[PDB]
């Protein structure tokens, strides 16, 4: 809040595009541009290369994830369900 009160990243859009639309965009704009922690090296190098594809600067590992987030809640849920079904089937 040093410079802007409640816009931050969406301050580049200025007065345009509507306050509610900018507020809705802000979450995605922060999430896609935020660098995550790579769970291969432990470094904060996971950067969104393109839509749904993330790249590690150090590991050079490319992971197919969400469009704006590294891991989506739907992906986590489906992974857990698939693991549970695999364990149930194999016993």
């Amino acid at each position: 809040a040093k410079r802007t009160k409640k816009v931050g990243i969406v301050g580049k859009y200025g007065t345009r595009y509507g306050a509610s639309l900018r507020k809705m965009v802000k979450k995605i704009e922060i999430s896609q541009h935020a660098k995550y922690t790579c769970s291969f090296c432990g470094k904060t190098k996971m950067k969104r290369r393109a839509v749904g594809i993330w790249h590690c600067g150090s590991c050079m590992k490319t992971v197919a994830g969400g469009a704006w987030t590294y891991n989506t809640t739907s992906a986590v849920t489906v992974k857990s369900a698939i693991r549970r079904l695999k364990e149930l089937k194999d016993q």
Partner: protein
Amino acid sequence: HDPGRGAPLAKVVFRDPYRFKKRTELFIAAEGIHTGQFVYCGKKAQLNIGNVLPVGTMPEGTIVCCLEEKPGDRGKLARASGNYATVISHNPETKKTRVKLPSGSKKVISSANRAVVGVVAGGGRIDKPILKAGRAYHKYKAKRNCW
């Protein structure tokens, strides 16, 4: 990244067991697939994310993507950006299965055709507003003259 397609693709290298060659395929990347990963395809393949196996073998309630509507068409169903099909129930007699499609329709499918376990990578793409004429123009320029 495939232009004009929300979902990213994945190049996978296999070895053809008839000639000394390395085959390359362009699969639709399921969410969670990373480089340097082994993917197993077939009737005996394990039930893990990023493994294409027939829907008859996998148990009920399995979430799949790039489902083959007919045996041998190399995957046509639920392969847009994050969509997925659900295996409802299997019928061992007549070799048929029931699949809930992302549109909500329940379709009877053959048990022979295969599907890739997991949802398609790149979900939540439509959540972000376009916010511009320019973003939509650039989106449709890579697809077709229809904007």
